[PDB]
């Protein structure tokens, strides 16, 4: 089975937070629980009556034919929690396994046929993943700021202004909130078109229809690869500067052993009448007081914090002296691709690459040396060797459209030159509803 | 009437081409062209002049302005005080500023109330245009043609670029055009007449 | 492909004179490419041939 193939399932909190209210306003029976004694025909009856491929898990061990029915029909089981998931199924194949799952987003549009109550997509969740977890006070700060940029007076918003209690501050957090009639007891009533107005059936994130229309385009903008120029991680390695392309990442050589960085690996030790910053080496346990002579190591540093200056300088010295390959995953940086004639205006010591605050954006520069003309036949030979340490871990130049707009030998194309993508040039047409389209490819 | 929209002419995009040139490269054979074809094709051939080392597509800073609080000098949007620590100063060059910038990008697009009106336009007499440009052209076009790579066809001195662009544009699956295109809303009225460019 | 004529923008050239004994240390090492050379006065090809 392929990664898209399998038995779909989701947490109950995801169910409650999203799909359930849509089940309520669409006027359908709440989808049946599956005891595991349940017939596949019953699941068919429920998916029929609820117009979504969803059932809630109830109690242990779903039977074979029902499980295979969920599998063929892509029914989304709602597990209360993910612990020991496989125990909830009786796998005759015995091929189901924890850790064999593929986690992924599933747009509500892919399950609901009712388009009216769908204003977004994967995009917004993907954006929220980038956001730091936010105390409610930070949420208020954000809202007050967006208000400030748009010149609204958000004073006393979200606040009580009682004469004797003073001003008081309620939370502004209210994701997926709806307008709902309450019982006098204070408990919420499920929405009823017979009494409540039609406008209350689904607060569309409380945005005007046009704002949703445009919001879609904006989400398509945000999640575009070309925009995404905040880059993560850098590989430190001691090569000669020979590859012209800025996006180059040196491949790790065949003999190298991967090693997670840990404070435990480095220590003080006596060695020839001095206290060396010894690196004990996990595959064999040999201590290595000198930065030179160490085994080839693709060391990975997830988190620089708390690392000593001695240890860092020793890792660098090991990159140079023992040809260590040191990935540092914690660096967030914004690359700028220079042309050879503008050189490197902004510089970076190894020390700063090692000891910069975890949250700060670094700004690395990377040459594209594609447009560097050949040396004259009689330029003096260079005995020296230009060397390099910092490399990107991921493609930079995601923004690049064209490159090397010069001729190699009048007619030939320079290696590494890029022509614009065809899509930049495809004025298509409009679809009958008015959306932009690319030209038809081939026919029909 | 309420000012529900903001009528404009010759609109800003959300994305613009930005180019780094190595000034030392320069083709020796000067390329004379028709004055008309030079005024359609010409902003493009300047922007993608010979010796351009890199041509990126950045967010349009002229659109995503500092009035929105968005800097773009680092090549990504950044906003000063949206997602911030509470009880201390935010600190310079925080990476959170990126997330904030996306939000404001997303906000500024969510609230883009612009509505295009046709600007000054031209109807080149066709015999005055080179055939490659005459095909691309559709009767009329704004004098502010903007910049598209498809215009480099038979104009760029760089040979392989012209071969590649010619190759793509010759394929059925892609088809550049410029100016007044016939559309389903053609002849529809709304005080004035809607048209497509 | 053509040989350059305008003076080119070369990376900075650090000279490390190498003595019989010395304490090597790599604090504050440059990360950008930078040519390193052992000798001074390496501009030795002075006899130009017309």
């Amino acid at each position: 089975d392929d990664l898209d193939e399998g038995i779909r399932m989701t947490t109950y909190d995801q169910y409650l937070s999203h799909i359930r209210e849509r089940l309520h306003i669409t006027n359908v029976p709440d989808p049946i629980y599956i005891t595991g004694a349940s017939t596949p025909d019953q699941i068919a009856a429920s998916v029929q009556a609820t117009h979504v491929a969803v059932v809630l898990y109830q109690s242990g061990v779903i039977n074979g034919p029902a499980s295979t029915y969920l599998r063929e029909n892509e029914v989304l089981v709602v597990m209360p929690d993910y612990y020991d998931v496989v125990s909830r199924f009786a796998n005759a194949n015995l091929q189901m396994n924890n850790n064999r799952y593929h986690e992924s987003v599933l747009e509500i549009a892919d399950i609901f046929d009712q388009a009216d109550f769908i204003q977004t997509s994967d995009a917004v969740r993907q954006l929220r993943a980038l956001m730091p977890t936010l105390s409610t006070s930070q949420i208020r700060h954000a809202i007050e700021r967006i208000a400030q940029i748009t010149d609204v007076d958000s004073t006393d918003y979200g606040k009580l202004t009682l004469r004797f209690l003073g001003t008081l501050t309620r939370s502004l957090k209210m994701q997926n909130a709806q307008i709902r009639r309450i019982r006098p007891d204070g408990t919420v009533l499920r929405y009823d078109d017979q009494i409540d107005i039609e406008a209350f059936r689904w607060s569309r994130y409380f945005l005007d229809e046009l704002q949703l229309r445009r919001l879609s385009v904006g989400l398509r903008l945000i999640t575009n690869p070309r925009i995404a120029r905040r880059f993560n991680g850098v590989r430190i390695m001691y090569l000669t500067d020979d590859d012209p392309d800025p996006d180059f990442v040196p491949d790790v050589p065949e003999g190298y052993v991967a090693v997670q960085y840990a404070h435990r690996l480095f220590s003080s030790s006596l060695a020839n009448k001095r206290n060396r910053v010894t690196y004990t080496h996990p595959p064999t346990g040999m201590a290595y007081p000198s930065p030179t002579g160490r085994p080839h190591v693709h060391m990975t540093i997830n988190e620089r914090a708390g690392m000593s200056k001695l240890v860092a300088d020793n890792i660098i010295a090991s990159v140079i002296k023992s040809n260590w390959v040191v990935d540092i995953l914690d660096i967030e940086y914004t690359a700028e691709v220079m042309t050879p004639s503008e050189g490197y205006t902004q510089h970076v010591d190894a020390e700063s690459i090692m000891t910069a605050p975890k949250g700060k954006l670094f700004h690395l520069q990377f040459m594209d040396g594609l447009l560097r003309p050949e040396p004259s036949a009689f330029d003096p030979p260079a005995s020296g060797e230009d060397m390099r340490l910092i490399y990107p871990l991921q493609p930079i130049s995601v923004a690049r459209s064209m490159r090397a707009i010069v001729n190699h030998n009048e007619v030939d194309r320079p290696r590494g030159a890029v022509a614009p993508s065809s899509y930049e040039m495809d004025t298509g047409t409009l679809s009958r509803n008015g959306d932009l389209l690319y030209s038809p490819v081939a026919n029909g | 009437l309420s000012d529900d929209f903001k009528q404009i002419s010759d609109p800003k995009g959300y994305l613009t081409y930005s180019v780094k040139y190595e000034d030392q490269f320069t083709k020796k054979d000067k390329l004379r062209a028709s004055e008309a074809d030079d005024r359609i094709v010409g902003p493009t051939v300047n922007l993608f002049k010979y010796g351009a080392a890199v041509v990126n597509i950045d967010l349009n800073r002229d659109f995503f302005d500092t009035a929105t609080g968005i800097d773009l000098t680092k090549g990504i949007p950044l906003v000063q005080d949206l997602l911030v620590p509470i009880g201390v100063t935010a600190g310079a060059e925080q990476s959170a500023e990126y997330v904030s910038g996306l939000l404001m990008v997303l906000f500024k697009v969510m609230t883009d109330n612009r509505l295009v009106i046709v600007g000054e336009t031209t109807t080149p007499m066709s015999n005055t245009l080179s055939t490659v440009v005459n095909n691309v052209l559709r009767t009329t076009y704004h004098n502010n043609v903007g910049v598209n790579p498809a215009l480099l066809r038979d104009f760029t001195q760089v040979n392989w670029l012209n071969r590649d662009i010619t190759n793509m544009l010759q394929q059925a699956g892609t088809k550049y055009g410029l100016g007044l295109t016939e559309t389903r809303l053609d002849y529809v009225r709304l005080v004035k007449t809607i048209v497509g460019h | 492909d053509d040989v350059g004529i305008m003076q080119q923008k070369k990376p900075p050239t650090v000279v490390q004179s190498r003595t019989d004994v010395f304490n090597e240390q790599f604090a504050n090492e440059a990360l950008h490419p930078t040519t390193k050379v052992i000798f001074n006065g390496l501009d030795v090809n002075t006899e130009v041939q017309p």
Partner: peptide
């Protein structure tokens, strides 16, 4: 002379829609 580098981005030319008093059509 020393070799050099330069940059250019496409410029904004957006303007509020012109008010014309003349009319194209009867």
């Amino acid at each position: 002379k020393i070799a050099t580098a330069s940059s250019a981005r496409q410029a904004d030319v957006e303007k509020p829609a012109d008010v014309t008093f003349t009319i194209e059509n009867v």
